[PDB]
From a paper:
Clear density for the TaTHI4 treated with NAD and glycine shows the expected glycine imine intermediate in the active site. Binding interactions between the intermediate and TaTHI4 include a hydrogen bond between N6 of adenine and the side chain of Ser178, a bidentate hydrogen bond with the 2′ and 3′ hydroxyls and Glu56, a second hydrogen bond between Arg58 and the 2′ hydroxyl, along with a stabilizing interaction of the glycine imine carboxylate and Arg239. Based on our reconstitution conditions, the bound metal in the active site can be assigned as ferrous iron, Fe(II). In summary, the comparative genomics, functional complementation, and structural evidence collectively implicate the bound metal as a natural determinant of THI4 aerotolerance, with Co(II) the best candidate although Ni(II) cannot be rigorously excluded.
In contrast, THI4s that use sulfide mediate multiple turnovers, i.e. are true catalysts. The crystal structure of the aerotolerant bacterial Thermovibrio ammonificans THI4 was determined to probe the molecular basis of aerotolerance.
Numbering used by the authors:
A (entry chain A), E (entry chain A): 3 to 263
B (entry chain D), D (entry chain B), F (entry chain D): 3 to 264
C (entry chain C): 2 to 192, 198 to 264
């Protein structure tokens, strides 16, 4: 009736066509938090080929838990309009403050992002970042990837190499991909200074306005996004308001779409 | 421009409301894996007040990773119609076998269940049931819940309690809730031995057949579905095919739905 | 200032030694400074018995600090309400029969009166075993085998010291650590079945009924009593925790007047 | 008779209102040791609204254990008068040296501080400050809080934010709050340098001297008390003598109470 | 000059043809210790299709370290003739006692086994064992496999299913595959009793003679081998003499080859 | 039939002999990865007394798992001839690119190196060098070795010492031996900074080119090869292509071989 082997063969064949397929993508996003997912949504909407490389088996990052396990997220008016196209239900709590359910937003955003074409590879840690000289200087043009698993158990397993036109570090507070660039290649970042400055303490107002503005190309071929943008640029954090996180992924997507012409 | 205080007010206030309004529910489901989520969808879609208590911050259980991190999940025709009530796109590989992306399927089923009214509490462990004499019967009457971090770190933190009319143990392989029921209370389960028998080795054809059959009331007030059904009744596991797990959830919600219109 | 480091060290050492040596023989040795153990030690010391409490944590209070799920509130019903009044714990009637208390104020106030009342606390100290001596023709618990908690955690080859008591109180909570041990290592029999799932009404009746001398010389109090007399727990209602501690203290004080 | 869902809802309701009514506070104390509790008592005595955020499930910091598990604390004359304001029994060892039972000192100070209105939240780590440019000046205006377990287990759970007119670092040797303030802001503190200098070795005379003197506003909006003050300003540690910790706490409360009438 | 992607594509394509290939093997050996490797050698020599599933990234099991890190192994006369076809150098220490270098024997055995055709999948834990009814009763006819990694980090990752005509539990002291059969299916083993009896304390003489004799089909479709044979049958261990381990893998191979007709 | 005593005698006696006869060697190689093994082969094949000290019980380094547990290793034409001195079978995938099974290649290279006379000590950490003044020069003169379990468990166990005429740091990415050389002794290495520079991000064409170039003497008496060469000199890593690593080992053995016929 039901062959164990057709099933293994099917799982094996599909994943590995899928991974051969994305050995070249236009945009490789690192981190499947909100900003990573929203960026990959819009880029997959505009038709580009988008891979998302997520350290944990699940996507969603720090949105699942809300604040202190109280799984309600807040967005202001900027980002409320992003809860709209993904279709996230929200009611108004006070003028300019829109509550949503943390689980609903995360799964709906993530479902629409993968349905738009963005491939997800979960369990995969972006380890380092391919940089070569292409007509002139050093340019980031790919990712070094391994199983998260391998990383933390400290196993001598060699990585695989994904190549891309643009990398988005949507990796959260730790900004680990641009940190790793910065540290291993010795370069300078477009941050003034030329380093991962480290995120400043909390101020919701300045914090979110800066997240949108910090979402830029800090080195040729690599964009920060979401909370890595505030870590890289040395701006304030904003607590559990997620409007700036969603907005950031949209900004990095349309801007990368702009250069992709 | 923004009051950090207002964001904090709104989160504390909202979650407080969500928790209070589910201290008494029709159906408390334990575990947001494939089968637990589908049961919550259909139970909500039929208009019942449902809460889901999930140990990890992210729902989806063993289904994120397809098999061996190879992001694909196979279903056969049985769960292939379940994949259409949710809008999970798929292709077939060979006749009768279907492939969906594991992440799309997990998040899509997840989204539509919580949109139907399934209220998800993540980072919450169900650690015991409420066991209480009804008309001359011990009956599972609800759950004893704590934060997962309290169990993990062995912190002396007392749990809270919710009441439900039915509890669904959908905790996977662990069969976690019924296992606790049997040892702390010395009751018997509707199984060959009276106990959680434990799953047998792999046989995909019998395993998927026995999952919908074992998804049943095993003691007054509590169902098992999913891998927990096979683990409780002593049937074969099936491997990375998810048609049983999805069908399991629909079957249990319909049976509990019927029982609720007595 | 003129603070001799030598004098501060000598004081701390001299005082603790003499406190420690003066409780090598106590009337009642209580294991566990959670709610029942502290309340039992208050009521016994207020009656003028030498009570020693042995708490594995550096802090007392056990599981009362967190209320439920870190939500710092204690709910007490009829019985525990009037014990709160014995200790001076403020409260507030949510609905008739239910009284809310600050979980931190209850713990620290109960702890404070218990130790002011004469009950001596030894924190950081794990009761590891009991002393079984034959007395009057039967085996009987006659005190404790104690070590540093930190020797148990890091698995260190360090011997215990021995406390002598007329009665021992296992107020260890869900673990029923002392009677489980006695039972496991002697091949005795008690009156440890393990607790049952939650039924808070039988749970708070069953905690006071079950706080009894389950083997010569050793009472069980509080949650330890329910786990031993395999009954139902109760959740974040603390009334029977407070009442059983007073109950055990009355029983023990009565048997000690003979 | 005993309805567990009435119990559950009273706890969920009181606590989450206790938390909302301290999203706004006059003074947020981080650290429920002897210094942080004493400042909390004297501020609450004077009627100001006070929250104390405590990392462990219990308060008491390092006073529980005396020195080397020997449960005795030594105070001199300056601690001696503070023990009498609390009703802590003591005995005189050699002239000008008083020893109290360390369990009695910790639980009594704690009890009276909380009876006077100091609200305490356990299992809650202050992990960062709110920094706001107030009239052209960067000022500490609150705390970023999370559950302790979330930091231990490295969970991706966002914080809640409270707001305060004054923050007291009373985190003992670690000087946790002012330490993260400096490295993440890059600011400078009222010392010779910035950040925390780190404590010197031991010299009880100078160590106790300097605790009283270093309990200061080291940056607008945040004070340091107790050993965080010695650590921040780089003075000597005193041994297991707690006179300076208690007096440190009382100084910071009277100083902050002054500034709260301006 | 040198494309990062042809390299990833090559590693991806080859492994996954290789794993599609062995979704059916004649014999799936669990454990790449000496007995597992010697069995797969001879079965691959006789032309059968042999997969080896090894929990650790390296093969060799407990042979690498010799005894107490003193990396010299001993074989008696039985097994000396097995050091011959693999070509392991050995000098005679005393009549009937042949020393070999632990690293040399392990790598040479393992190289000749993989060169004979035995495929190795390392990092792969055999988790459970497919049993179905095939004309009559329950028969072991495959393996449930996952990444070792997954197992120990306790990650909810589903396994894959390999199907085979015969399974060899060459898994060492722990006999984990037949233990897992025995415990999950409730069956009885051909051991008298019907359980993993557990290995007896040490006696070199009886221990090694029993290893050869205990290497049998303890349940339809599954063979023990090497040190799992002594664990399953309740016989003595033999210390760091490895002659019986090598002999056992040969016996299980020619006997399984016999039934494969 | 058998004397357990005789087996134990023969193991203790044999290993004792093997250890003693290598307390003084021509070349002590640290690390039995791809590049370390190939260098030991060619150095033995040319008749020099070689010892290899490998931290783990199994040689082979990062090469067992090909890439991401996908058991295949790519080499280009450069290491494609190296694969023939050992008899590692391969196919080509696209022109100039070759695939060998990672397990066959690892064990085959390993077998032939130890058969050529390379004596392998596994479970042994090189933790320091011997540094000793020769004709008016500090020169690496040998190694300080301990059991890996002593380092892992932080046991107070003193090491032993071997002497060699050349030490080859082939410890992969860690560049473990030269890193210790630089910090404990304050020497400089033949590199841009004088220090272990650290590897740069990935560039497979330059990475493999720079590996044979950086496989050189970096301080009197010690070479680097393999990934340690790239890590010490600050070049690009290359990913899962092993032609540099094999060529690296042959180059270093030839250079050390020449230097040894001064
Ligand atoms: C608003 C806020 N903080 C404000 C405040 O604290 O005041 C938050 O914390 C938000 O969650 C931040 O949103 P954002 O999308 O920027 O990040 P996230 O949710 O933390 O997602 C990051 C993702 O990136 C993953 N990740 C990490 N590092 C790697 C790696 N090398 N390779 C692959 N993935 C990696 C990681 O698993 C995670 O899922
Ligand atoms: C097909 C298959 N196996 C076949 C095979 O192996 O051969 C699978 O693994 C499927 O994923 C099984 O799906 P199913 O929905 O039955 O279970 P799951 O995916 O493992 O999810 C169960 C959920 O329950 C959670 N959970 C556990 N215990 C508790 C607890 N006390 N309280 C709250 N939640 C808990 C747990 O985190 C998990 O998320
Ligand atoms: C009502 C309720 N639960 C209902 C429910 O969950 O459904 C509770 O949990 C209450 O907090 C229980 O109150 P109770 O006083 O019975 O127990 P507790 O708070 O856990 O205190 C036990 C004390 O005993 C300590 N302890 C443990 N074992 C030893 C040992 N061998 N030696 C010395 N001390 C030990 C331990 O650290 C602790 O302080
Ligand atoms: C006299 C002496 N030392 C002298 C010497 O060693 O020679 C002492 O140890 C005294 O006990 C010092 O008393 P003091 O009140 O200054 O500090 P403490 O007892 O150590 O308590 C600080 C409290 O602060 C808590 N805490 C820490 N960090 C955080 C954080 N980020 N957030 C929330 N709470 C936190 C922490 O759990 C602790 O309870
Ligand atoms: C002679 C002796 N002892 C005598 C004495 O002590 O007196 C020995 O220890 C010999 O090494 C035994 O040789 P043998 O080939 O029988 O076993 P081994 O060397 O221990 O190899 C077992 C292999 O099996 C592996 N393994 C384990 N369990 C699993 C699993 N579920 N799935 C996949 N692989 C697994 C494991 O990694 C290992 O490599
Ligand atoms: C191609 C590639 N990377 C490219 C990329 O990532 O992009 C690789 O990983 C290759 O495997 C590198 O081969 P190479 O022979 O250079 O190094 P390796 O395989 O990692 O082996 C080094 C050996 O050295 C061992 N070792 C470490 N440190 C010590 C120590 N102090 N003492 C004794 N041995 C030690 C260690 O166990 C290991 O076995
Ligand atoms: Fe590498
Ligand atoms: Fe409890
Ligand atoms: Fe002893
Ligand atoms: Fe955050
Ligand atoms: Fe499963
Ligand atoms: Fe030394």
């Amino acid at each position: 009736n039901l062959s164990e082997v057709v099933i293994s063969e099917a799982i094996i064949t599909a994943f590995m066509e899928k991974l051969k397929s994305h050995l070249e993508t236009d945009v490789a996003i690192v981190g499947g938090g909100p900003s990573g997912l929203v960026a990959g949504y819009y880029l997959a909407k505009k038709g580009y080929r988008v891979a998302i490389f997520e350290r944990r088996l699940s996507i969603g990052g720090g949105m699942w838990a809300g604040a202190m396990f109280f799984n309600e997220i807040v967005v202001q008016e900027m980002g409320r309009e992003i809860l709209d196209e993904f279709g996230v239900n929200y009611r108004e709590f006070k003028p300019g403050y829109y509550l949503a359910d943390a689980v609903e937003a995360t799964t709906t955003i993530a479902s629409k992002a993968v349905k738009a074409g963005a491939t997800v590879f979960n369990g995969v840690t972006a380890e380092d970042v391919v940089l070569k000289q292409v007509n002139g200087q050093y340019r980031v043009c790919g990712l070094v990837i391994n199983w998260t698993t391998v990383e933390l158990n400290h196993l001598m397993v060699d990585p695989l190499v994904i190549t891309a036109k643009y990398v988005v570090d949507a990796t959260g507070h730790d900004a680990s991909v641009v940190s790793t660039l910065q540290r291993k290649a010795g370069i300078k970042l477009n941050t003034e200074t030329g380093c991962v400055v480290g995120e400043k303490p909390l101020w919701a107002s300045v914090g979110e306005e800066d997240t949108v503005k910090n979402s830029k190309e800090v080195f040729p071929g690599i964009y920060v996004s979401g909370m890595a943008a505030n870590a890289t640029c040395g701006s304030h954090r904003m607590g559990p308001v997620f409007g700036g996180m969603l907005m950031s992924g949209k900004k990095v997507a349309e801007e990368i779409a702009a250069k992709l012409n």
